[PDB]
Amino acid sequence: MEMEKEFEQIDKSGSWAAIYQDIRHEASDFPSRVAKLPKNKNRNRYRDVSPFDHSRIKLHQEDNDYINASLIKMEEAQRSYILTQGPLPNTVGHFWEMVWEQKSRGVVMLNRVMEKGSLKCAQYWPQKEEKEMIFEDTNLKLTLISEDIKSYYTVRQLELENLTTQETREILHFHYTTWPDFGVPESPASFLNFLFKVRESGSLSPEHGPVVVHCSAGIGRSGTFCLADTCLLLMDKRKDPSSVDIKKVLLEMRKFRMGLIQTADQLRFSYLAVIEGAKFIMGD
Numbered sequence: 031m032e033m034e035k036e037f038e039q040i041d042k043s044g045s046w047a048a049i050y051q052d053i054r055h056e057a058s059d060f061p062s063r064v065a066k067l068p069k070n071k072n073r074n075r076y077r078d079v080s081p082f083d084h085s086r087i088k089l090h091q092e093d094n095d096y097i098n099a100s101l102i103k104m105e106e107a108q109r110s111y112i113l114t115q116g117p118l119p120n121t122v123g124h125f126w127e128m129v130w131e132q133k134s135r136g137v138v139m140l141n142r143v144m145e146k147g148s149l150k151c152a153q154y155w156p157q158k159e160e161k162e163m164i165f166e167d168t169n170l171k172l173t174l175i176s177e178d179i180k181s182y183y184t185v186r187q188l189e190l191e192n193l194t195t196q197e198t199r200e201i202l203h204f205h206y207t208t209w210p211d212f213g214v215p216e217s218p219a220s221f222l223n224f225l226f227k228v229r230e231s232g233s234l235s236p237e238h239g240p241v242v243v244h245c246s247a248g249i250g251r252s253g254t255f256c257l258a259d260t261c262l263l264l265m266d267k268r269k270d271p272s273s274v275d276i277k278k279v280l281l282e283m284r285k286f287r288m289g290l291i292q293t294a295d296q297l298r299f300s301y302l303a304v305i306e307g308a309k310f311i312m313g314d
C-alpha cells in the first residue's frame with residue numbers, strides 16, 4: 031500500500047502508538063551474552079541496550095574484543111552500516127580502533143556532547159588543529175585537518191594514524207547539530223539534505239568499510255538515518271517503488287540490533303523523511 035496513503039490513514043485515525051507497539055511485539059530476540067559479562071559493565075552506556083552476539087563488531091585483540099556496536103547488513107539494498115553508542119571515557123580508544131580495523135571512511139554523529147544538561151558522549155575528536163589526541167591503549171593518533179560549520183551540520187576532515195605501522199587515512203566526520211533536545215524535527219528537509227551530503231562524500235559506498243553511525247544509545251536517531259537511506263535506495267532499484275514497506279525494512283534491520291526507532295514520533299518522522307525524499311528520487 032502506497033506509504034503516503036498509509037501515512038494519512040494512521041494520522042486521521044491517530045494510531046501511531048498502536049503501529050509502533052506491533053513492531054515492538056514482532057521484533058527479533060537474540061542472545062547478547064558477551065555484552066552482559068561483568069568485565070564489560072563499564073563498556074556499556076545503558077544496561078538495556080546491547081549488541082546481539084551474532085552481529086556484534088569484534089575488536090582485533092586477544093585481551094578483550096568487546097565494543098557496543100552492531101553490523102547491519104541490508105542484502106537487497108547492498109548497503110552495510112555499523113550502529114554504535116556514543117563513546118564513553120574508557121571506550122574512545124576502542125571506538126577509533128574499530129574505525130581503523132573496519133576500513134570505514136565516514137563517522138555520522140546525530141547528537142550533541144551535552145543535551146538536556148547531561149553528557150551524552152565523550153569529546154572523542156580534537157577541536158583545534160595544533161592539539162592532536164593520542165589513544166595510548168590502542169596506539170592511534172587523531173588530528174583535526176579542517177572544519178566546515180553550516181547552520182544544520184558540521185563536516186570535519188580528520189587524519190587517523192596507526193602508530194604501530196605509521197600508516198595514515200583520511201576520515202570524514204558528519205555532525206548533525208540541530209536535532210531538538212525533545213521530540214523530532216518539524217520538517218525532514220535538513221535531515222534529508224544531511225543524508226544527501228554523507229552519500230555525496232563516498233562514505234556509504236562499497237569501495238569503503240561500513241559507515242559508523244551513532245547517537246547516545248545508537249538505536250533511535252541512528253535507526254532513523256539507516257532506515258531512511260535503505261528505503262530510498264530500494265525505491266530507486268525496484269520496478270514498483272510503491273512496493274517498499276517501511277515496517278518490513280525496520281523489522282529486517284531489528285534482526286541485527288535491538289530497539290531501532292525508540293518512539294512512535296521517531297517512526298512517524300521516518301515515514302515523513304522517506305515520503306518527501308521520494309519526490310526527488312522519482313526525477314525532481
Ligand SMILES: CC(C)C(=O)N1CCC(Cc2ccccc2)CC1
Nearest residue numbers: 222223225226262306307308310311
Ligand atoms: C540537489 C539535490 C540532489 C539534493 O540535495 N537532495 C537531497 C534532499 C532530497 C531527498 C533525499 C534523497 C536521497 C538521499 C537524501 C535525501 C532530494 C535530493
